[PDB]
Amino acid sequence: GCPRACETWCNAQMTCVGIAEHVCPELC
Length: 28
Hints:
- The PDB classes it as peptide binding protein.
- By secondary structure, the chain is an alpha+beta fold.
- The protein contains two helices and two strands, in the order αββα.
- It has helices spanning about 5-10, 25; strands at about 10, 15.
Protein backbone atom coordinates (compact mmCIF):
# COMPACT_ATOMS: atom_id res chain seq x y z
CA GLY A 1 0.00 0.00 0.00
CA CYS A 2 1.16 3.50 0.88
CA PRO A 3 4.98 3.95 1.38
CA ARG A 4 7.24 2.18 3.89
CA ALA A 5 6.80 4.44 6.93
CA CYS A 6 3.31 5.52 5.99
CA GLU A 7 1.54 2.28 6.88
CA THR A 8 3.08 2.38 10.36
CA TRP A 9 3.11 6.18 10.92
CA CYS A 10 0.28 7.63 8.83
CA ASN A 11 -3.50 7.36 8.62
CA ALA A 12 -5.67 7.33 5.50
CA GLN A 13 -6.88 10.85 6.34
CA MET A 14 -3.44 11.94 5.10
CA THR A 15 -2.40 12.14 8.72
CA CYS A 16 1.27 11.23 8.74
CA VAL A 17 3.04 11.74 12.06
CA GLY A 18 6.51 10.54 11.14
CA ILE A 19 8.94 11.11 8.27
CA ALA A 20 6.48 9.10 6.18
CA GLU A 21 4.93 12.48 5.44
CA HIS A 22 7.94 13.18 3.21
CA VAL A 23 6.88 10.62 0.63
CA CYS A 24 3.42 9.30 1.53
CA PRO A 25 1.16 12.32 0.67
CA GLU A 26 2.48 11.94 -2.89
CA LEU A 27 2.03 8.16 -3.26
CA CYS A 28 -0.87 7.39 -0.95
